[PDB]
């Protein structure tokens, strides 16, 4: 084969069930085709191919899809956008993300980087071709990347430019850490439980990896410094409910009698600032009974403080808010090429 770099409109594929009322299933039933029943991955002999996860139009395309999914599926009692108000009915929905495959039309193919320690930019030596990506769950969150894929070998630091502190850092974990979030049967009070032993061990490895990238400086974690609640809290959607969880206990440099269960305090919020950047939305109060989601932490979103150039330290704070980084954390090993 012979190819050239190119962008083109993708289509999606999924295992969505036509009988489900769950909203990702409904969306994917009418906006995606069924998954490839016979996927074939073709290794490319003696092929080195350069990738750049930070300039990858697949990310913008998935982002457009997820905006469309949420716009079609979430039913606010009151939308507030641009100096407008839209009232409507806001019934409780069934919400649980399903994997979505992204696929090339005729004349194009997806190249896949299989170097286990590939950081997202530069040459890839073990390159395969695929017709569709693997199935990516479109999980919206801040601070912690949830229910994703794990790095196969070492923890990976991904950034467009580590030297530029305005550029988000994506940490790719090699070992998931469960986060178990419950609103038990104050109806908005909730909590998340994490195994502190595993978390602290993983976070210690993360600090050592950051030390490799920052000329051995001391790595310090601190809580976010201002912003909207969606960014200063780990925010995510559990069964249709918007959870906001305080992570100060996770970014604790002293534990880097503290090896039991970490319990993060959370609140379910009805009024949110939408990640589509469109303004505020109000939803109904939470459903009755026990509301529970067990998720895998598979990545971390970090921002490094500026102004530490002449100091002995680098300090990192949980970040997020641009969901493109969530999609990028999974699309990093893929790029579209035009077959020539
Ligand atoms: C570029 C930095 O971010 C922003 O400027 N934003 C504006 C205000 C907060 C927005 C947000 O993140 N909303 C959100 C909503 C629901 C869930 Cl479940 C969630 F995880 C995140 C993003
Ligand atoms: C290339 O990646 C494949 C995964 O597709 C894996 O078996 C191995 O790491 C590599 N194999 C070869 C022959 O390079
Ligand atoms: C990623 O790898 C390339 C070498 O291909 C290097 O130039 C770049 O600094 C690396 N970035 C990170 C964040 O490790
Ligand atoms: C959580 O991680 C394990 C591997 O660490 C994986 O087998 C399991 O399927 C993951 N769960 C989810 C919901 O992704
Ligand atoms: C995870 O990566 C670190 C290096 O960043 C390594 O020390 C550790 O052995 C890895 N763990 C697993 C389970 O691969
Ligand atoms: C990375 O960021 C630093 C500081 O913002 C800047 O001086 C440098 O030119 C950037 N490097 C690249 C390759 O963009
Ligand atoms: C999650 O936590 C709840 C209550 O904290 C508990 O009942 C449940 O067994 C936990 N599930 C897992 C998988 O740890
Ligand atoms: C907490 O993590 C430790 C260390 O990895 C592990 O032995 C144990 O399975 C976890 N705790 C429980 C109650 O499973
Ligand atoms: C960083 O510290 C490590 C500690 O193992 C050492 O091996 C290495 O020489 C140091 N590198 C720099 C650039 O300071
Ligand atoms: C998180 O909890 C700490 C105390 O545990 C508190 O000082 C901090 O203000 C909380 N974060 C936010 C965003 O309220
Ligand atoms: C992660 O996956 C599990 C298993 O499908 C699910 O129960 C959980 O709610 C998911 N978490 C989020 C935040 O979607």
Domain boundaries along the sequence of the chain: 1-340
102 lines ligand 1 (CB under 6 A): no
How far does the centroid of ligand 7 lie from the alpha carbon of residue 262, in Å? 13
> What are the DSSP calls for 78-121, one per residue?
EEE-TT--EE------------BEEE--TTEEEEEE--TT--SE
How far does the centroid of ligand 1 lie from the alpha carbon of residue 246, in Å? 15
DSSP state of 51: E
Ligand nearest to the CA of 195: 8
Q: How was this structure determined?
A: X-ray
Contact (CB, 8 A) for 333 and 116: no
Joined together, the tokens standing for residue 244 give 């906001």
167-to-125, 158, 186, 295, 322 alpha-carbon distances in Å: 26, 10, 39, 26, 11
182 lines ligand 7 (CB under 6 A): yes
Contact (CB, 8 A) for 108 and 8: yes
Residue nearest to atom 6 of ligand 9 (CA): 216
Rounded Cα distance between 34 and 103, Å, is 11
203-to-208, 255, 273 alpha-carbon distances in Å: 9, 10, 29
| Resolution expressed in Å | 1.8
Residue nearest to atom 12 of ligand 4 (CA): 147
Rounded Cα distance between 120 and 332, Å, is 6
Strand 313-318 to strand 291-304: parallel, antiparallel, or no bridges (unpaired)? antiparallel
Neighbours of 307 (CB within 10 A): 7
Joined together, the tokens standing for residue 59 give 């990310």
Query: What is the number of the ligand 10 atom nearest to the C-alpha of 249?
Result: 5
């Amino acid at each position: 084969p012979v190819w050239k770099d190119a962008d083109t409109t993708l289509f999606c594929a999924s295992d969505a069930k036509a009988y489900e009322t769950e909203v990702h299933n409904v969306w994917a039933t009418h906006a995606c085709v069924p998954t490839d029943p016979n996927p074939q991955e073709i290794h490319l002999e003696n092929v080195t191919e350069n990738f750049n996860m930070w300039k990858n139009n697949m990310v913008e395309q998935m982002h457009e899809d997820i905006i469309s999914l949420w716009d079609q599926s979430l039913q606010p009692c009151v939308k507030l956008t641009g100096g407008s108000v839209i009232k409507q009915a806001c019934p409780k929905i069934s919400f649980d993300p399903i994997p979505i495959h992204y696929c090339t039309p005729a004349g194009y193919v997806i190249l896949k980087c299989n170097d286990k320690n590939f950081n997202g930019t530069g040459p890839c030596k073990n390159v395969s071709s695929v017709q569709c990506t693997h199935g990516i769950k479109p999980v919206v969150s801040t601070q912690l990347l949830l229910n994703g894929s794990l790095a196969e070998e070492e923890i990976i630091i991904r950034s467009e430019n580590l030297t530029n502190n305005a550029k988000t850092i994506i940490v790719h974990l090699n070992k998931s850490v469960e986060i178990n979030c419950t609103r038990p049967s104050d109806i908005r009070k909730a909590y998340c439980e994490i195994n502190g032993t595993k978390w602290n061990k993983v976070l210690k490895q993360v600090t050592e990896k950051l030390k490799e990238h920052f000329n051995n400086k001391t790595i310090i974690f601190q809580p976010p410094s201002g912003g909207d609640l969606e960014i200063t809290m780990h925010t995510f959607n559990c069964r249709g409910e918007f959870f906001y969880c305080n992570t100060t206990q996770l970014f604790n440099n002293t534990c880097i009698g503290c090896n039991g269960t970490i319990t993060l305090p959370c609140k379910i919020k009805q009024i949110i600032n939408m990640w589509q950047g469109t303004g505020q939305a109000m939803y109904a109060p939470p459903i009755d009974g026990k509301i529970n989601c067990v998720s895998n932490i598979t990545g971390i979103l970090l921002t490094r403080d500026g102004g530490a150039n002449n100091t002995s330290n680098e300090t990192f704070r949980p970040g997020g808010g641009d969901m493109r980084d969530n999609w990028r954390s999974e699309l990093y090993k893929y790029k579209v090429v035009q077959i020539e």
